[PDB]
PDB file of C-alpha atoms in Angstrom:
ATOM      1  CA  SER A   1      -7.980 -14.464  11.085  1.00 23.70           C
ATOM      2  CA  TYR A   2      -7.945 -17.839  12.246  1.00 20.58           C
ATOM      3  CA  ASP A   3      -8.726 -18.990   7.357  1.00 24.25           C
ATOM      4  CA  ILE A   4      -4.998 -19.832   6.334  1.00 22.10           C
ATOM      5  CA  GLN A   5      -5.991 -19.781   2.298  1.00 21.89           C
ATOM      6  CA  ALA A   6      -8.072 -16.500   2.812  1.00 21.52           C
ATOM      7  CA  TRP A   7      -5.443 -14.468   1.489  1.00 23.97           C
ATOM      8  CA  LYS A   8      -5.768 -16.052  -2.149  1.00 24.13           C
ATOM      9  CA  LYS A   9      -9.728 -14.334  -1.911  1.00 23.56           C
ATOM     10  CA  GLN A  10      -8.430 -11.065  -0.941  1.00 24.74           C
ATOM     11  CA  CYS A  11      -5.488 -10.791  -3.479  1.00 21.66           C
ATOM     12  CA  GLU A  12      -7.955 -11.494  -6.363  1.00 24.01           C
ATOM     13  CA  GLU A  13      -9.969  -8.729  -5.019  1.00 25.71           C
ATOM     14  CA  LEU A  14      -6.880  -6.196  -4.485  1.00 24.74           C
ATOM     15  CA  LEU A  15      -6.048  -6.439  -8.482  1.00 22.79           C
ATOM     16  CA  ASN A  16      -9.332  -6.028  -9.723  1.00 23.95           C
ATOM     17  CA  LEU A  17      -9.448  -3.499  -7.528  1.00 21.27           C
ATOM     18  CA  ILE A  18      -5.453  -2.316  -9.268  1.00 22.41           C
ATOM     19  CA  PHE A  19      -6.390  -3.372 -12.929  1.00 21.57           C
ATOM     20  CA  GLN A  20      -9.457  -0.636 -13.181  1.00 23.93           C
ATOM     21  CA  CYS A  21      -7.234   2.122 -11.097  1.00 20.78           C
ATOM     22  CA  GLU A  22      -6.592   4.192 -14.192  1.00 14.58           C
ATOM     23  CA  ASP A  23      -2.561   4.202 -12.418  1.00 19.03           C
ATOM     24  CA  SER A  24      -2.311   0.390 -13.750  1.00 15.62           C
ATOM     25  CA  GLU A  25      -2.679   0.809 -16.860  1.00 13.55           C
ATOM     26  CA  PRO A  26       1.260   0.752 -17.387  1.00 13.81           C
ATOM     27  CA  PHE A  27       2.226  -2.005 -15.449  1.00 15.74           C
ATOM     28  CA  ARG A  28      -1.140  -3.857 -16.947  1.00 13.94           C
ATOM     29  CA  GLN A  29       1.254  -6.005 -19.560  1.00 12.34           C
ATOM     30  CA  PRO A  30       4.941  -7.264 -19.378  1.00 14.20           C
ATOM     31  CA  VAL A  31       6.840  -3.824 -20.729  1.00 10.07           C
ATOM     32  CA  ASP A  32       7.234  -3.964 -24.656  1.00 10.51           C
ATOM     33  CA  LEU A  33      10.345  -2.981 -25.766  1.00 10.38           C
ATOM     34  CA  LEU A  34       9.667  -2.297 -29.357  1.00  7.94           C
ATOM     35  CA  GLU A  35       8.862   1.142 -26.369  1.00  6.98           C
ATOM     36  CA  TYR A  36      12.002   0.684 -24.852  1.00  6.86           C
ATOM     37  CA  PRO A  37      14.395  -1.485 -26.354  1.00  4.21           C
ATOM     38  CA  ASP A  38      17.299  -1.271 -23.960  1.00  3.68           C
ATOM     39  CA  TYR A  39      14.834  -1.822 -20.584  1.00  8.78           C
ATOM     40  CA  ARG A  40      16.414  -5.626 -20.305  1.00  7.91           C
ATOM     41  CA  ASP A  41      19.543  -3.674 -20.136  1.00  9.20           C
ATOM     42  CA  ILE A  42      18.248  -2.174 -16.945  1.00  4.07           C
ATOM     43  CA  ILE A  43      16.193  -4.611 -15.410  1.00  4.14           C
ATOM     44  CA  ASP A  44      16.913  -8.586 -14.887  1.00  4.72           C
ATOM     45  CA  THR A  45      13.737  -9.203 -14.232  1.00  3.08           C
ATOM     46  CA  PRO A  46      10.586  -7.987 -15.787  1.00  4.58           C
ATOM     47  CA  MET A  47       6.881  -8.208 -13.726  1.00  2.00           C
ATOM     48  CA  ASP A  48       3.692  -6.973 -14.338  1.00  2.00           C
ATOM     49  CA  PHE A  49       0.261  -7.582 -13.141  1.00  2.00           C
ATOM     50  CA  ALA A  50      -1.568  -9.534 -15.437  1.00  2.00           C
ATOM     51  CA  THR A  51       1.947 -12.131 -14.395  1.00  2.00           C
ATOM     52  CA  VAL A  52       1.279 -11.626 -10.785  1.00  2.00           C
ATOM     53  CA  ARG A  53      -2.849 -12.803 -11.720  1.00  2.00           C
ATOM     54  CA  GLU A  54      -1.752 -15.358 -13.865  1.00  2.00           C
ATOM     55  CA  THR A  55       0.316 -16.417 -11.090  1.00  2.00           C
ATOM     56  CA  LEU A  56      -2.446 -16.234  -8.521  1.00  2.00           C
ATOM     57  CA  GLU A  57      -4.834 -17.972 -10.609  1.00  2.00           C
ATOM     58  CA  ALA A  58      -2.322 -20.714 -11.597  1.00  2.00           C
ATOM     59  CA  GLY A  59      -2.143 -21.673  -7.840  1.00  2.00           C
ATOM     60  CA  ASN A  60       0.906 -20.503  -8.054  1.00  2.00           C
ATOM     61  CA  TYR A  61       1.773 -18.493  -5.063  1.00  2.00           C
ATOM     62  CA  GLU A  62       1.352 -19.941  -1.539  1.00  2.00           C
ATOM     63  CA  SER A  63       1.651 -16.603   0.551  1.00  2.00           C
ATOM     64  CA  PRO A  64       0.471 -13.687  -0.423  1.00  2.00           C
ATOM     65  CA  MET A  65       3.912 -12.365   0.962  1.00  2.00           C
ATOM     66  CA  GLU A  66       5.106 -13.850  -2.182  1.00  2.00           C
ATOM     67  CA  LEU A  67       2.508 -11.869  -4.444  1.00  2.00           C
ATOM     68  CA  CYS A  68       3.637  -9.192  -2.077  1.00  2.00           C
ATOM     69  CA  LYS A  69       7.620  -9.748  -3.182  1.00  2.00           C
ATOM     70  CA  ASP A  70       5.786  -9.250  -6.863  1.00  2.00           C
ATOM     71  CA  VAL A  71       4.143  -6.306  -6.649  1.00  2.40           C
ATOM     72  CA  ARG A  72       7.281  -4.566  -5.750  1.00  4.10           C
ATOM     73  CA  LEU A  73       8.871  -5.747  -8.446  1.00  2.00           C
ATOM     74  CA  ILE A  74       7.164  -3.523 -10.616  1.00  2.44           C
ATOM     75  CA  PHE A  75       7.014  -1.125  -8.661  1.00  2.00           C
ATOM     76  CA  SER A  76      11.495  -1.196  -8.399  1.00  2.00           C
ATOM     77  CA  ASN A  77      11.563  -2.136 -11.726  1.00  2.00           C
ATOM     78  CA  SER A  78       9.485   0.923 -12.553  1.00  2.00           C
ATOM     79  CA  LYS A  79      12.098   3.927 -10.583  1.00  2.00           C
ATOM     80  CA  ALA A  80      15.080   1.665 -11.621  1.00  2.00           C
ATOM     81  CA  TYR A  81      14.267   2.579 -15.556  1.00  2.00           C
ATOM     82  CA  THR A  82      12.642   6.234 -14.802  1.00  2.00           C
ATOM     83  CA  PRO A  83      14.567   8.260 -16.281  1.00  3.55           C
ATOM     84  CA  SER A  84      13.209  11.181 -13.455  1.00  4.28           C
ATOM     85  CA  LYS A  85      11.494  10.704 -10.389  1.00  2.00           C
ATOM     86  CA  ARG A  86       9.462  12.847 -11.985  1.00  3.32           C
ATOM     87  CA  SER A  87       8.226  10.976 -14.939  1.00  2.00           C
ATOM     88  CA  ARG A  88       4.618  10.759 -15.636  1.00  2.31           C
ATOM     89  CA  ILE A  89       5.151   6.223 -15.068  1.00  2.00           C
ATOM     90  CA  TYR A  90       6.872   6.599 -12.201  1.00  2.09           C
ATOM     91  CA  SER A  91       4.714   9.197 -11.022  1.00  2.00           C
ATOM     92  CA  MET A  92       1.250   6.569 -11.523  1.00  2.00           C
ATOM     93  CA  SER A  93       3.499   3.957  -9.745  1.00  2.00           C
ATOM     94  CA  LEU A  94       3.561   5.822  -6.345  1.00  2.00           C
ATOM     95  CA  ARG A  95       0.652   5.951  -6.010  1.00  2.00           C
ATOM     96  CA  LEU A  96      -0.309   3.444  -6.793  1.00  2.00           C
ATOM     97  CA  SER A  97       2.905   1.362  -4.739  1.00  2.00           C
ATOM     98  CA  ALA A  98       0.632   3.593  -1.533  1.00  2.00           C
ATOM     99  CA  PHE A  99      -2.289   2.337  -2.556  1.00  2.00           C
ATOM    100  CA  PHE A 100      -1.007  -1.437  -2.823  1.00  2.00           C
ATOM    101  CA  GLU A 101       0.343  -0.889   0.453  1.00  2.00           C
ATOM    102  CA  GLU A 102      -2.254   0.638   2.533  1.00  2.00           C
ATOM    103  CA  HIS A 103      -4.054  -2.869   1.098  1.00  2.00           C
ATOM    104  CA  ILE A 104      -2.033  -5.712   1.456  1.00  2.00           C
ATOM    105  CA  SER A 105      -1.329  -4.633   5.037  1.00  2.00           C
ATOM    106  CA  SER A 106      -4.307  -6.104   6.554  1.00  2.00           C
ATOM    107  CA  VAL A 107      -3.691  -9.552   3.901  1.00  2.00           C
ATOM    108  CA  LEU A 108      -0.250  -9.787   4.695  1.00  2.00           C
ATOM    109  CA  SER A 109      -1.210  -9.494   8.858  1.00  2.16           C
ATOM    110  CA  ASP A 110      -4.644 -11.677   8.728  1.00  2.46           C
ATOM    111  CA  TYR A 111      -2.568 -14.234   6.742  1.00  2.22           C
ATOM    112  CA  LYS A 112      -0.086 -14.165   8.912  1.00  2.00           C
ATOM    113  CA  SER A 113      -2.025 -14.292  12.500  1.00  2.00           C
ATOM    114  CA  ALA A 114      -3.370 -17.663  11.021  1.00  2.00           C
ATOM    115  CA  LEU A 115      -0.459 -19.033  10.169  1.00  4.64           C
ATOM    116  CA  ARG A 116       1.176 -18.494  13.826  1.00  3.74           C
ATOM    117  CA  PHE A 117      -2.664 -19.533  15.480  1.00  2.00           C
ATOM    118  CA  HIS A 118      -2.381 -23.165  12.796  1.00  2.16           C
ATOM    119  CA  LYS A 119       0.723 -23.859  14.642  1.00  6.57           C
ATOM    120  CA  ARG A 120       0.703 -22.443  17.781  1.00  6.45           C
ATOM    121  CA  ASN A 121       0.609 -26.618  18.773  1.00 12.54           C
ATOM    122  CA  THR A 122       3.612 -27.592  16.628  1.00 12.90           C
ATOM    123  CA  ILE A 123       5.764 -28.840  19.410  1.00 13.10           C
ATOM    124  CA  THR A 124       2.547 -31.448  21.836  1.00 12.49           C
TER     125      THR A 124
END
């Protein structure tokens, strides 16, 4: 892989897949405080897939690692807020996390390789 910019469209396509997945529905918009009134007593940094997509489309991610950090925050927030490791919403977050990780792995690898290639002659 050579193309330093290719990650962005790859991430757009992966977000499209995630938004079509039923398991994403609890995570597509910010958590509703009327539904979960003490959410911000537990969760310091909310995150959701609409926020991630908007950040990407605004040109506010520099790398796929930044996007990957925010997506992982969606899942760590679900784990931190879950009352049970058997709860429905958390259970959906685990399947969606596995899907995400399986797909993001090549995006990250190819970007990092492409960038190492770009920098291969940094010293000369």
